[PDB]
Design a binder for this molecule. Structure first.
Ligand SMILES: CCCC[C@H](NC(=O)c1[nH]c2c(c1C)C(=O)CC(C)(C)C2)c1nc2ccccc2[nH]1
Ligand SMILES: CCCC[C@H](NC(=O)c1[nH]c2c(c1C)C(=O)CC(C)(C)C2)c1nc2ccccc2[nH]1
Ligand SMILES: Nc1ncnc2c1ncn2[C@@H]1O[C@H](C[C@@H](N)CC[C@H](N)C(=O)O)[C@@H](O)[C@H]1O
Ligand SMILES: Nc1ncnc2c1ncn2[C@@H]1O[C@H](C[C@@H](N)CC[C@H](N)C(=O)O)[C@@H](O)[C@H]1O
Ligand SMILES: [Zn+2]
Ligand SMILES: [Zn+2]
Ligand SMILES: [Zn+2]
Ligand SMILES: [Zn+2]
Ligand SMILES: [Zn+2]
Ligand SMILES: [Zn+2]
Ligand SMILES: [Zn+2]
Ligand SMILES: [Zn+2]
Lengths: 266, 270
């Protein structure tokens, strides 16, 4: 069975690079039961605080590579090396909040503290997996620490999330608590699966606003990733505690945490 | 015999598609820094802009949105951009129509033909010291008629706020004929447009445009060339008789055109 290219770019040109879709596994057509968006949307009054005088910002006259950058200090330090990658000493288990530079900073748009706001740079592909439906994999080697993509979707309150009947695309910001629901509106990140041996991590980031209701979710590689490797992050125990009553994990890792065999041993 | 100095390689600090340098060959005035350059409109208090994605009108096109089926074109009466991204010749240059560009709710691609203003500055511009009008903006290249130049960017404020500030040197009135009145004030936060002088023989026109939202209270202001512009020519638009009927009480127009309407030479004729 050939691996049919079925969409040249599921992002319709909204990302820096195309995201093709292929399926060499079954007959499932290119997913179209959602609206691809590259940035978060709202479907009720959120009124994100965008008051430019409310932004904390830096006064740097360099490239914001020094430890005196206020934006870096709000992040404990700027965690981006010279190439835009997270430092090796970055805490991949309890990631800090990242405050990037913004439109109030005196620095230039290309300073060292602007990785997530500059968008996707790696070649990704939406593909049909063997056991998990659609997935996302790398079309290039990706060094550890590289920004992959943002979890983009519909901004909704925790109360609205509690009413909705499909939480398969719901990312809880864990702040009043708000969520990103990618069920109806989403980007490439809604197709990234759970892996008990993840290779990307979510990190909360502020960029062009600092409304603490709405951190933005940035995925970075937690290790070097080989070409063709599926991308995945740890959906978390709360997800699998709820979803256990319906299905079990198919990641096939020797340290799988939620497989039938694994849960049966409990 | 003063030589021209380059005093900033990009007043936009890299926020635009292209750098916008500033030069002075006229006096000792340094690069203006009494404002904050921003590439997009800002808020200093809650405007409650309607950004509900389900309120967007959008098209269902699969092509490059060049057909008459495109709803976004229809909302503008038609799509007024030609294949090159220029406003059509028959486009009304007096009371122009609202332009509704395609948006994130449309099914078309980000590169369709109805996305000129949201794609940003493409022509090469220069901030320079004029002889009689302070700073101005001039073209570094030929600019054919109909080309998008830049957006009037600044701080969104209410009518009542504008009336408190009593300073319209950098104030653009959106002139919403229906309901709530808002202004763009580029005094404190602005982009290259704040530096565009008034000309009695103008070569650009402002056009109200909607892009990522369709809150009719907050059209965005897009400047397009109203004629072919030659390299070196200062850009300017007609500030409007209302501006001068207020300001001529204080100073006269220095555009120096034979068709000047606000000169001292012409102020004694009527
Ligand atoms: C589909 C999306 C992946 C599953 C999704 N993850 C998250 O919400 C989530 N929030 C957070 C993290 C993570 C994985 C972190 O790592 C840290 C944090 C960003 C601070 C907060 C999820 N978990 C759920 C639990 C119950 C009901 C629905 C659920 N959806
Ligand atoms: C300094 C900024 C350029 C002067 C500025 N122009 C405008 O507001 C303005 N609005 C409009 C157009 C124009 C020039 C149009 O061509 C048509 C339109 C876009 C529908 C509405 C101005 N004029 C004023 C008159 C009185 C008090 C303050 C003022 N500010
Ligand atoms: N490790 C996993 N084991 C089994 N199913 C998974 C796993 N990870 C993701 N899934 C499936 O994918 C859903 C989560 C989605 N966000 C991921 C995209 C999904 N695979 C799709 O094709 O749309 C889950 O509700 C599961 O149906
Ligand atoms: N036609 C004109 N004649 C004389 N002064 C003008 C003319 N057009 C603009 N100006 C001056 O520039 C102001 C408008 C500004 N938005 C333009 C930039 C301004 N020249 C500056 O140097 O900052 C006016 O209040 C005047 O001070
Ligand atoms: Zn800095
Ligand atoms: Zn900063
Ligand atoms: Zn910076
Ligand atoms: Zn597993
Ligand atoms: Zn269309
Ligand atoms: Zn459209
Ligand atoms: Zn379109
Ligand atoms: Zn004049």
């Amino acid at each position: 069975r050939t691996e049919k290219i079925i969409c040249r770019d599921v992002a319709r040109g909204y990302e820096n690079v195309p995201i093709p879709c292929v399926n060499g596994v079954d007959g499932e057509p290119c997913p179209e039961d959602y609206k691809y968006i590259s940035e978060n949307c709202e479907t009720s009054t959120m009124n994100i605080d965008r008051n430019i005088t409310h932004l904390q910002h830096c006064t740097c006259v360099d490239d914001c590579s020094s430890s005196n950058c206020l934006c870096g200090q709000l992040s404990i330090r700027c965690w981006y090396d010279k190439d835009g990658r997270l430092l090796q000493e970055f805490n991949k288990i309890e990631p800090p909040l990242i405050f990037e530079c913004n439109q109030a900073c005196s620095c230039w748009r290309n300073c060292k503290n602007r990785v997530v706001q500059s968008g996707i740079k790696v070649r990704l592909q939406l593909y049909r997996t063997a056991k998990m439906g659609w997935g996302v994999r790398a079309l290039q080697t990706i060094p550890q620490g590289t920004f992959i993509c943002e979890y983009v979707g519909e901004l909704i309150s925790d109360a609205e999330a509690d009413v909705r009947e499909d939480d398969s695309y719901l990312f809880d910001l864990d702040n009043e608590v708000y969520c990103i629901d990618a069920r109806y509106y989403g980007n490439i990140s809604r197709f990234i699966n759970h892996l008990c041996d993840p290779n990307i991590i979510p990190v909360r980031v502020f960029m062009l606003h600092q409304d603490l209701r709405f951190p933005r979710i940035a995925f970075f590689s937690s290790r070097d990733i080989r070409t063709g490797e599926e991308l995945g992050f740890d959906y978390g125990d709360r997800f699998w505690d709820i979803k256990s009553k319906y299905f079990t994990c198919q990641c096939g890792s020797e340290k799988c945490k939620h497989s039938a065999e694994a849960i049966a041993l409990e």
